Design a protein around this ligand. Structure first.
Ligand SMILES: *[C@@H]1O[C@H](CO)[C@@H](O[C@@H]2O[C@H](CO)[C@@H](O[C@@H]3O[C@H](CO[C@H]4O[C@H](CO)[C@@H](O)[C@H](O)[C@@H]4O)[C@@H](O)[C@H](O[C@H]4O[C@H](CO)[C@@H](O)[C@H](O)[C@@H]4O)[C@@H]3O)[C@H](O)[C@H]2NC(C)=O)[C@H](O)[C@H]1NC(C)=O
Ligand SMILES: *[C@@H]1O[C@H](CO)[C@@H](O[C@@H]2O[C@H](CO)[C@@H](O[C@@H]3O[C@H](CO)[C@@H](O)[C@H](O)[C@@H]3O)[C@H](O)[C@H]2NC(C)=O)[C@H](O)[C@H]1NC(C)=O
Ligand SMILES: *[C@@H]1O[C@H](CO)[C@@H](O[C@@H]2O[C@H](CO)[C@@H](O[C@@H]3O[C@H](CO)[C@@H](O)[C@H](O)[C@@H]3O)[C@H](O)[C@H]2NC(C)=O)[C@H](O)[C@H]1NC(C)=O
Ligand SMILES: *[C@@H]1O[C@H](CO)[C@@H](O[C@@H]2O[C@H](CO)[C@@H](O[C@@H]3O[C@H](CO)[C@@H](O)[C@H](O)[C@@H]3O)[C@H](O)[C@H]2NC(C)=O)[C@H](O)[C@H]1NC(C)=O
Ligand SMILES: *[C@@H]1O[C@H](CO)[C@@H](O[C@@H]2O[C@H](CO)[C@@H](O)[C@H](O)[C@H]2NC(C)=O)[C@H](O)[C@H]1NC(C)=O
Ligand SMILES: *[C@@H]1O[C@H](CO)[C@@H](O)[C@H](O)[C@H]1NC(C)=O
Ligand SMILES: *[C@@H]1O[C@H](CO)[C@@H](O)[C@H](O)[C@H]1NC(C)=O
Lengths: 136, 480, 101, 121, 136
């Protein structure tokens, strides 16, 4: 589920390996997600549409990270406990068997709850820290 | 949950199979962005197409060539390119005046095919004889004076018998339905290789295990930023200037038992074909309107009576034999019997292609006249015909006129694939063997090249359990 | 080959009674059933195995695994009698005739 | 919408040819596959051929490919058919036919009203 | 002036309530500010124009938060004292009476001073922390 990252792979070369042997391309994956590629004709519209859609994708992802207190990092520990309804998952295969491309299917149908949980916990922590600073 | 906490991860290797608009990457470089068009100078991007392939350890992905939307993207891009490029050019509407035509005349030329001088067009029957000499009143620039111009048209470009069967008066064929536009001479454009590059946030996957049937898993997967050079060539009954499979001949259909579904055959060794129109065409230039010029073939000087294509006999014979062997594997315990073209419009009843801006049509009955798993038990010559007025693709309503090209024209090509269909009802004991050549949408041509690729969007955010509670505690957990 | 073979060719059925027809298939492929209203243009009934055509009540149903399909028409009304054909990509079965007693 | 019009009936002599017409409406005639089915009385319906109106490509059932010719006209939305040499055994109804999606050759639509023709002597 | 945050209101539903309650809806307004909505014709220009202006406004706001040391949070305590020139505002009405729509009219004519004071104090603190790290 974690390990020491690298950037020399260039792009998505892993993939395939387990999560503990695949969560290491985070730098390069973050890089390539936005960088590049770059008589009357209209394909300027197509190029602008593609560029704007990519930029909006990146901004939405960064905003979702920012709400949860995770902006400024790729890895991010959080406070939300594992759901009361799950308490069951196959962690023995999380650590060293399932690749991300497989694990992403098992968290589907439940991801929507996790974002709300993270948001609520972060806002509680925010107001708690503000109160703590305002205590004295 | 005293040992169990979530964790956010970003930049994670996950993707899903969405659809998007791809970038056009040129050859790097043949584009003069406005001076002339070679394929897409006004529109497409010149940039480095270096694929930079990457292999993946244990990925297994499902590919489908028939549902590959990139062929639809190619279709739309090609149609838009041709439509916007032909728009500024001259209109042929003023040229639809009544045409009085008569048989051509030869000023003592010589014939290639026989050791004697030309005597009569009816016996010297090629180029001369199929081509009519027409004269017509046309307007000068000042709109108050008219003159008797003349030009020579191919017989398919003119239509009698709606001018009554005794008048010897001809129209242009297009005027019955639509008005044509001439191709701009500076715009003349040819099959430059093109590469497709994914936009930001998308990855183009490629399958290397070439021998998969076309719809199933592929294990030798690889990732590429820009596809290899695809040539936007269009031809019917035969793919040319294509790639080649590393294994021997390959055959592809979503259901071979579904007879109406086209069968694409992909070769491993190319068969060279040479096509030529001898004789020096003289480009006549006649004025229309204030500042428009119309090009037409004047007299044809030099030796005349040929319009041919040539194919090596034994090479094509063995290629067809290997096709027959593979189809015998797929269709067990029965022969394979190739046959003449089924019929239909001449754009698909004949092999079609363009060389040097001149459109060719060639009778292919010489080529598919086979028998059991091969031909029956030296160069094969194809008689051909030429048109100038063109319906752009199959049956779309956009017409076009091709200006003639002066001097003799010769082109070479590598035949790489075939397009076939099968006989229908049965008569079981005597039907499965039959196969014929068939036409093809340009989707069928481009599928043989965009076979390999798939488009997926990155989902760079993921969640998983880890050992950390934020600022508080650790974890007890499991292992494989 | 002989891709389709329907049976029974002749059937006698009283009104309100359930009908049964069978179509073999010697090769892998789609299957279907057509209703020939007597002296009229036939019409689609079932296609792709068990899926019903548009506007057909639920009386018409069937199923298969591989080389044998059973068609059943519960409580056939008088109007739905006639001749029924089995089709697969080009072929037609010899047909099965159902008449009202 | 789908609509398959057809010509009326007629009576023919042995060895002579017939022509038949079938006209489309309510959809794109160019892109959609079209079919023809013979339907003789009291025996197997028989396949006759296909037609793709875009390119005019055709394909024929083998026992009839020495006689059948199938054509179309895009600007009139009309399909046409012919038998180059008839016999009494050709007595049957002729049904021009589509598929509803017609990305699939099989049919899977009308079946327009048909047209009966008899060969007699 | 502060409240335990929420996201279940969908959009701008409050509004109206006092600042001490209207300050709970920060997450949903932050989310909806950028997300969504998504032969030759030109309204592609209109769509691209709207998207680009929305993205540019969001980037300007995030940059202004970043300069003041507040990027990554919705609430943000700072160091700038209440201005020497003000010392008069109606805080009893701030906490539980005035809504944000009313209070925004009173901080007008003076906000431009705050947008300078905040960055001044932040840069002072930045160089101070850099010097403190350099001390060792
Ligand atoms: C399939 O693949 C084959 C190659 O394997 C392609 O073959 C080429 O076809 C093109 C036409 O489609 C040919 O282009 C023409 O070549 C003529 C000869 O070129 C030689 O001689 C000239 C001097 O005469 C030299 O400058 C040149 O470097 C060569 O040594 C040219 O004279 C023609 O010029 C005309 O076109 C250009 C480009 O538009 C204009 O700028 C000119 O002003 C002029 O109008 C023309 O370029 C090419 O020669 C063929 N190559 C070979 C090796 O034979 C097939 O085209 C391709 N597609 C198909 C369908 O077969
Ligand atoms: C394609 O293949 C055909 C057939 O093989 C080639 O036709 C040949 O063309 C040459 C000229 O290019 C002819 O040469 C002449 O032959 C006569 C004798 O017949 C001789 O008296 C003349 O002096 C001259 O040499 C040759 O006859 C002719 N062959 C045949 C069988 O007609 C053709 O050249 C090939 N290439 C192309 C581009 O068509
Ligand atoms: C390609 O070229 C061949 C040979 O030039 C063409 O074959 C000829 O096609 C015509 C028209 O179909 C045939 O005409 C028929 O002839 C029979 C007698 O054999 C007659 O009874 C019919 O009424 C009709 O006139 C001709 O026989 C045939 N000849 C040969 C040698 O095949 C072919 O049509 C061309 N195809 C294309 C697509 O250009
Ligand atoms: C499938 O057909 C091929 C022939 O099409 C049979 O194999 C043998 O193939 C060679 C090479 O093509 C034939 O020799 C060549 O014949 C051509 C005339 O077609 C000639 O132009 C070449 O110069 C060379 O002589 C050879 O005749 C042929 N053998 C026979 C008995 O025809 C193969 O046997 C066929 N498949 C089966 C299962 O029989
Ligand atoms: C095509 O027809 C034109 C017009 O009839 C021919 O041009 C004339 O040819 C005659 C001799 O045949 C000359 O006296 C004239 O001077 C030519 N020009 C005009 C304007 O009349 C032309 O030669 C014919 N070409 C062929 C190949 O038959
Ligand atoms: C061609 O040459 C023949 C023989 O020399 C001659 O009779 C004829 O007039 C010449 N011209 C034409 C147009 O045939
Ligand atoms: C077709 O092949 C047969 C083989 O028996 C041959 O007799 C015939 O002449 C060929 N016809 C053409 C036009 O190639």
């Amino acid at each position: 589920a974690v390990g020491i990252g690298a950037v020399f792979l260039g792009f998505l070369g892993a993939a395939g390996s387990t999560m503990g042997a695949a969560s290491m391309t985070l730098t390069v994956q973050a890089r390539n997600l936005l960088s590049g590629i770059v008589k009357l004709t209209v394909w300027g519209i197509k190029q602008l549409q593609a560029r704007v859609l990519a930029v909006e994708r990146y901004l939405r992802d960064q905003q979702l990270l920012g709400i949860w207190g995770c902006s400024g990092k790729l890895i991010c520990c959080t406070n939300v406990p594992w759901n009361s309804s799950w308490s069951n998952r196959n962690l023995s295969e999380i650590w060293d068997n399932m690749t991300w491309l497989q694990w992403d299917k098992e968290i589907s149908n439940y991801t929507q709850i996790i974002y709300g949980l993270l948001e609520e916990s972060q806002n509680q922590q925010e107001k708690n820290e503000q109160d703590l600073l305002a205590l004295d | 949950a005293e040992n169990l906490w979530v964790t956010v991860y970003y930049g994670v290797p996950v993707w899903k199979e969405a659809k998007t608009t791809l970038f056009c990457a040129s050859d790097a470089r043949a584009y003069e962005k406005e001076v002339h068009n070679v394929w897409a100078t006004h529109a497409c991007v010149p940039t480095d197409p270096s694929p930079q392939e990457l292999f993946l350890e244990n990925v297994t992905e499902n590919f489908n060539m028939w549902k590959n939307d990139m062929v639809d993207q190619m279709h739309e891009d090609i149609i838009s390119l041709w439509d916007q490029s032909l728009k500024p050019c001259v209109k042929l509407t003023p040229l639809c005046v009544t045409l009085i035509c008569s048989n051509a005349t030869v000023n003592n030329r010589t014939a290639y095919d026989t050791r004697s001088n030309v005597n009569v067009t009816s016996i010297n029957n090629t180029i001369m004889g199929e081509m009519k000499n027409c004269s017509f009143n046309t307007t000068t620039e000042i709109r108050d004076k008219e003159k008797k111009e003349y030009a020579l048209f191919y017989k398919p470009d003119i239509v009698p018998l709606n001018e009554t069967s005794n008048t010897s008066e001809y129209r242009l064929i297009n005027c019955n339905t639509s008005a044509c536009t001439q191709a701009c001479p500076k715009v003349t454009f040819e099959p430059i290789p093109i590469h497709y590059c994914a936009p930001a946030g998308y990855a183009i996957l490629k399958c290397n295990n070439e021998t998969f049937n076309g719809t199933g898993p592929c294990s030798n997967v690889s990732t590429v930023q820009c596809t290899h050079g695809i040539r936007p060539v269009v031809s019917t009954q035969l793919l040319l200037n294509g790639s080649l499979a590393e294994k021997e001949i390959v055959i592809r259909s979503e259901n071979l038992t579904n007879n109406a579904k086209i069968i694409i055959v992909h070769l491993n060794t190319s068969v060279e074909i040479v096509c030529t129109r001898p004789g020096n065409n003289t480009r006549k230039s006649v004025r229309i309107g204030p500042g428009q010029t119309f090009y037409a073939t004047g007299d044809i000087i030099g030796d005349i009576r040929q319009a041919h294509c040539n194919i090596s006999e034994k090479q094509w014979n063995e290629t067809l034999q290997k096709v027959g062997k593979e189809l015998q594997k797929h269709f067990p315990n029965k022969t394979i019997k190739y046959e003449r073209s089924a019929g239909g419009d001449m754009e698909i009843a004949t092999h079609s292609f363009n060389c040097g801006g001149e459109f060719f049509y060639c009778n292919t009955s010489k080529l598919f006249n086979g028998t059991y798993n091969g031909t029956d038990i030296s160069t094969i010559t194809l008689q051909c015909r030429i048109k100038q007025i063109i319906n752009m693709w199959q049956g779309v309503g956009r017409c076009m006129y091709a200006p003639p090209i002066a001097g003799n024209i010769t082109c070479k090509s590598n035949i790489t694939g075939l397009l076939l269909t099968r006989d229908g009802g049965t008569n079981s004991n005597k039907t499965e063997e039959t196969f014929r050549p068939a036409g093809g949408d340009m989707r069928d041509n481009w599928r043989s090249e965009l076979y390999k690729y798939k488009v997926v969007k990155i989902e760079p955010l993921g969640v998983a359990p880890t050992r950390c509670k934020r600022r508080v505690v650790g974890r007890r957990r499991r292992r494989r | 080959e002989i891709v389709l073979t329907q049976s029974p060719g002749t059937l006698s059925l009283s009104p309100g009674e359930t009908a049964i027809i069978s179509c073999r298939t010697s090769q892998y492929g789609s299957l279907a059933w057509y209703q020939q209203r007597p002296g009229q243009a036939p019409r689609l009934v079932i296609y792709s195995g068990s899926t019903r055509a548009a506007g057909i009540p639920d009386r018409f149903s069937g199923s298969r695994w591989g080389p044998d399909y059973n068609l059943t028409i519960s409580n056939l009304e008088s109007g739905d009698f006639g001749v029924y054909y089995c089709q697969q990509y080009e072929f037609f079965g010899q047909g099965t005739k159902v008449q009202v007693d | 919408q789908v609509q398959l019009v057809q010509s009326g009936g007629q009576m023919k002599k042995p060895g002579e040819s017939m022509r038949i017409s079938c006209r489309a409406s309510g959809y794109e005639f160019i892109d959609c596959t079209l079919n023809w089915i013979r339907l003789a009385p009291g025996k197997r319906p028989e396949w006759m051929g296909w037609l793709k109106p875009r390119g005019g490509a055709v394909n024929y059932a083998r026992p009839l490919q020495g006689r059948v010719t199938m054509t179309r006209d895009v600007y009139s939305d009309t399909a046409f058919l012919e038998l180059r040499s008839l016999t009494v055994d050709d007595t049957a109804v002729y049904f021009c036919t589509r598929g509803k999606n017609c990305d699939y050759n099989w049919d899977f639509e009308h079946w327009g009203r048909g047209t009966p023709v008899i060969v007699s002597s």
